[PDB]
Design a protein around this ligand. Structure first.
Ligand code: HEM
Ligand code: HEM
Ligand code: HEM
Ligand code: HEM
Ligand SMILES: C[C@H](Oc1cc2cc(F)ccc2nc1N)c1cc2c(cnn2CC(=O)O)cc1-n1cccn1
Ligand SMILES: C[C@H](Oc1cc2cc(F)ccc2nc1N)c1cc2c(cnn2CC(=O)O)cc1-n1cccn1
Lengths: 146, 141, 141, 146
């Protein structure tokens, strides 16, 4: 991912302020509510029948934190996203059969959650920098299709 | 296809948007041009600098069309017919760009209306913008 | 959003299927399972061998639902409400799979009804299958 | 792209029978009729206002033949699609800004045209082999989107 120095600084500084206990769970929860077919991949989580059931589900919160950890790993290796996400791409693509459009959807829901948490501080240039990051993560996760 | 709860959520949310509709429309366009620079290719004739009167004026037109869509949510093919002719027949906008603007609108609403932007409302707004996008990108006359 | 010419084209091309509903639906499913093997994950309970009576029986149901969609083309959210409950609420089918089956249906129609499969008709059928797919993948009840 | 020897033989045998003056032009013409926003990239072709105007347009027919030649180049280099399509990826992604979903659409329209021309000989296993080829070409053309 090609980020300007000012974009790299803005991304890193905002990321340091992210509530790690909440943001990942809110992003995964919102994916499950906004794109309900994604719930098919999480039958082991139990009740996901209402937005409140999804958002208060401890498995969504815990899994969301793991997803947030993977985006964090992406931000630490923007020059080698393919290598970083290689085993995760194998898991999603060969074992889970997640259609790659869903990776773009989750990236964009994460951006919505960042805007929801940061308000007006999630400025159009800060968003533009995050859009480069989430596109990069989504493409790296889809790399093992062929 | 919108559910009755979706229509209620969108009407409640866009009513809270209220007087700021135009401002949110201009910010969503600015977010789209900066985040997805290929979208600028549809606006070579615009001054796209920050705080451009042209983008502000255009944001108000876009927001007014969405307000019209909300007011006629069950009759969008007729209410938006002139806009579908413009986007689908004249401008030939690739539908991916409507996903981009729709996402930027959701980001703007999340940033400005946090209390209203619940997961259920976010879901309803995404479905509403997808339905508006289908109307504006389809040739149905 | 379908145009009046689209609805005319769809009624004409779909009607030509006639008594062969089962054969077309079953071939579109076989094409989908072979071309996009991940789609088999939704049918673990089916015998998917070539010429399977189960796939034939299912192909007839799929084709008959599309005939019902054509017969109620302006009221698909009501006519297809039970199918939307099944695909959107119960099975939670990823919408990409509907693009895959729609493509396989177009391929089957191209192969077996060449005279009917003109570019205008291909365009109208693609729009109709996309509209049916939106209804079946949306939770609006 | 991996094709079994049986698939490779079936694909090659049908490809040898393709009417080179018609198939590429019908695939590009159908893309312009079925997904009308694609016409924005072909303003220099003149009249594309009706399906008959598109299908009879000599620029669509000639350009369609070049597109068919590029798919043919893909079949000749299945082991190196990224390399084969490097200059065309730069043109489509970097110069024209064609959204990559449109590459998948053209691949699938070509498969519809092959079914239209070959009828019952375009069997479900032959289609499955062609779907691997067109997915490979589309992914290789999308390579420069990173
Ligand atoms: C696009 C960004 C994504 C990232 C960074 C991501 C990251 C992760 C991580 C780090 C794991 C845990 C790996 C392990 O414990 O072995 C995981 C597991 C998984 N992911 Fe993703 N994921 C993404 C998108 C998706 C999407 C869109 C879906 C489904 C729609 C999905 C479904 C799953 C499932 C089902 C698992 C296994 C969960 C389990 O163990 O029960 N992921 N993902
Ligand atoms: C929710 C989606 C959208 C809505 C409601 C919308 C609404 C509008 C409206 C109301 C107009 C002005 C029509 C007039 O004054 O007669 C317009 C113009 C236009 N729109 Fe959209 N639009 C949307 C999406 C898009 C997208 C995604 C693009 C391209 C990225 C786009 C490109 C244009 C262009 C190029 C014009 C002409 C601008 C001018 O010369 O004044 N629109 N749109
Ligand atoms: C045009 C698109 C489609 C139509 C019209 C359609 C129609 C139908 C119909 C009529 C039924 C039987 C309902 C009943 O007997 O109560 C059905 C069942 C089903 N459909 Fe679809 N379907 C479509 C697309 C899909 C796709 C894309 C998938 C997944 C790839 C899918 C997976 C299923 C499954 C798993 C069942 C249940 C099969 C069974 O247990 O009998 N369908 N569909
Ligand atoms: C996915 C398969 C595709 C292949 C194999 C392909 C192949 C080609 C080839 C071989 C050229 C000629 C290059 C040259 O002369 O230097 C070309 C040019 C071009 N292609 Fe594609 N293309 C594809 C998809 C698309 C799509 C989907 C669009 C637009 C929606 C597009 C738009 C163009 C344009 C505008 C040009 C330049 C034409 C001109 O010179 O006026 N192509 N393409
Ligand atoms: C008036 C509209 O009508 C249609 C919307 C459509 C949306 C396609 F995406 C495809 C076909 C459609 N056909 C309609 N008649 C409609 C009818 C609906 C529902 C839910 N149930 N019903 C039936 C009923 O209330 O009696 C939702 C919508 N809707 C409005 C905006 C978006 N969707
Ligand atoms: C009844 C339906 O109604 C809707 C379809 C919709 C499709 C969305 F994709 C989104 C919203 C829709 N809202 C409708 N009311 C409809 C109304 C239309 C046209 C063209 N013009 N008009 C208006 C008019 O004839 O008076 C096409 C459709 N159509 C039927 C199936 C698919 N589209």
């Amino acid at each position: 991912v090609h980020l300007t120095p000012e974009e790299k600084s803005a991304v890193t500084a905002l990321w340091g302020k992210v509530n790690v206990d909440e943001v990942g769970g809110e992003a995964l929860g919102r994916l499950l509510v906004v794109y309900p077919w994604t719930q098919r991949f999480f039958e082991s989580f139990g009740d996901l029948s209402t937005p409140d059931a999804v958002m208060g589900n401890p498995k969504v919160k815990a899994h969301g934190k793991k997803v947030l950890g993977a985006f964090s790993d992406g931000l630490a290796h923007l020059d080698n996203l393919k290598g970083t996400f290689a085993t995760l791409s194998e898991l999603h693509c060969d074992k889970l059969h997640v259609d790659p459009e869903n990776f773009r959807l989750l990236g964009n829901v994460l951006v919505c959650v960042l805007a929801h948490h940061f308000g007006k501080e999630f400025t159009p240039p800060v968003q533009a920098a995050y859009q480069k990051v989430v596109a990069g993560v989504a493409n790296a996760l889809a790399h093992k299709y062929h | 296809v919108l559910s009755p709860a979706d229509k209620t959520n969108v009407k409640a949310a866009w009513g809270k948007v209220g007087a700021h509709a135009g401002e949110y429309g201009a910010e969503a366009l600015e977010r789209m041009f900066l985040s997805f620079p290929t979208t600028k290719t549809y606006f070579p004739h615009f001054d796209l600098s920050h705080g451009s009167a042209q983008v502000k004026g255009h944001g108000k037109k876009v927001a007014d069309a969405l307000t019209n869509a909300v007011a006629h949510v069950d009759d969008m093919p007729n209410a938006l017919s002139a806009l579908s002719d413009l986007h689908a027949h004249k401008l030939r906008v690739d539908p991916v760009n409507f996903k981009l603007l729709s996402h930027c609108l959701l980001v703007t609403l999340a940033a400005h209306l946090p209390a209203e932007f619940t997961p259920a409302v976010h879901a309803s707004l995404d479905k509403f913008l997808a339905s508006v996008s289908t109307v504006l990108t389809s040739k149905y006359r």
